[PDB]
Amino acid sequence: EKGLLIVLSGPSGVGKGTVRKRIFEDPSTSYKYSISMTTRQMREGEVDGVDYFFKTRDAFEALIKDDQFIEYAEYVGNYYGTPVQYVKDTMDEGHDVFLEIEVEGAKQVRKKFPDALFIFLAPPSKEVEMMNLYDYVVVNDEVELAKNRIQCIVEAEHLKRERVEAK
Amino acid sequence: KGLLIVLSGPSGVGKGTVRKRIFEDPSTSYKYSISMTTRQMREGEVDGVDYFFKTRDAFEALIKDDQFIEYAEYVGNYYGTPVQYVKDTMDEGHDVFLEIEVEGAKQVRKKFPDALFIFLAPPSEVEMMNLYDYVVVNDEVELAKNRIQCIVEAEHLKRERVEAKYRKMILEA
Ligand SMILES: Nc1nc2c(ncn2[C@@H]2O[C@H](COP(=O)(O)O)[C@@H](O)[C@H]2O)c(=O)[nH]1
Ligand SMILES: [K+]
C-alpha cells in the first residue's frame, strides 16, 4: 500500500527542524525526507542534491508553470519548494514521507494530497491562529515529548479503519 | 468534555482481556463504564466491579425507562451501558471507556456519532469494521493496549479539539 505523507509545520522558531531531526533519529520508524529546491545561492559546505536542489529562478518558475511543486513559497526574493515526483514515487514504494513546510503552505499541499497528515507544532503556553489549516496540534514543550506525540499520531494513522479496510 | 472511547469487535477476540490490561496500567487516565448484565456472576467476579449484576425484570424495566446508552442480548443474557455514569463522567472532563459487543456499538454510534470507535480484530469481519474509526489487531495483549493508547493520545491532539481549547482561553481572558 501507499506510504503516508506527513506534513510538519509551525511558526518560525518553534523548533520544527529539531523535532524532525529527533523523529528521523528514532529507529522504531522509517521515514523518507524530501530534498527541497531553492533559487538561493549555495553556501559554504553545501552540496547540490544533498542540502537542496539549487535552481535558477527561471527554472523554478518553469517548474511552477508545469505544476512540478506540491507547494512553494518565495522568501526574501528566493523560491523554496517541494518537487512532486520524488514524493509521489516514494509513497508509491510504500514509504512514509515526512515533509517540513512553512505554515501557509498546508493549503497548497492539501489540495493535491487531501489525506496527508498535517501536524502543527505549537510553542509552549494569537498569531498561532493558522492551526486551522492543520489536522493535529503538538506542543513543542520538550523535543522528546513532541517526538513521541507525533509518533502516536503517525501510528494511529496506520491503524485507521479506511487503510486497514482497503488492505 | 472527555472522549467516549468504544472498544468492540468479534466474539472471543479478547476485548475483555485488553480492557483489563488497559485499566491495570497506572498511566491510564480513562474511566471504565461498568456495565449491567443479567448473566450469573462467576467465580472471582465482584458485583459493582466486574458488572452491576441485575435480574431480567430489573434490566427490562431499565430498558423501558430509557436508562441505557445501548443494550444487547449476548448468548441469552442482557448486557448494557447505564446512561448516567457515562454522561456525568464525560461532563467532568474524563474520558469514558466502553468494552461492548458489536450490536451495542451500533447503538452507541447512532447516539454519539463523534465517539471514538476502535475495532479489535483477530490475528486471523470486513463488513463488521464499517462503522469503526480504527482497527487494532489483538496479536498480543500488551501490543493491543499500546496501540489503543496511542489512538486515544492522537484524538486528544486533534486540531479541532485543541483549537477549541485555545479559543475558549483567549475569549475568556
Ligand atoms: N453491548 C454490550 N456488550 C457488553 C457489555 N458488557 C460486556 N459486553 C460484551 O458481552 C460479551 C460477554 O461478556 P462476558 O459474559 O464474557 O463477561 C463480551 O463480548 C463483552 O464485550 C455491554 O455493556 N454492552
Ligand atoms: K463492559
From Swiss-Prot, chain B:
It holds the Pfam family Guanylate_kin. The keyword Nucleotide-binding applies. Its main location: cytoplasm. GO terms for molecular function: ATP binding; guanylate kinase activity. It comes from the Bacteria. Residues 2-153 form the Guanylate kinase-like domain. InterPro entries: GK/Ca_channel_bsu, Guanylate_kin-like_dom, Guanylate_kinase, Guanylate_kinase_CS, P-loop_NTPase. Keywords: ATP-binding, Cytoplasm, Kinase, Nucleotide-binding, Transferase. It catalyses: GMP + ATP = GDP + ADP. It is found in: Cytoplasm. ATP binds at G9, P10, S11, G12, V13, G14, K15, G16. Its EC number is 2.7.4.8. The keyword Transferase applies. HAMAP family: Guanylate_kinase. NCBIfam families: guanyl_kin. Essential for recycling GMP and indirectly, cGMP. Belongs to the guanylate kinase family. This is Guanylate kinase. It comes from Staphylococcus aureus (strain COL). The lineage of its organism: Bacteria, Bacillati, Bacillota, Bacilli, Bacillales.
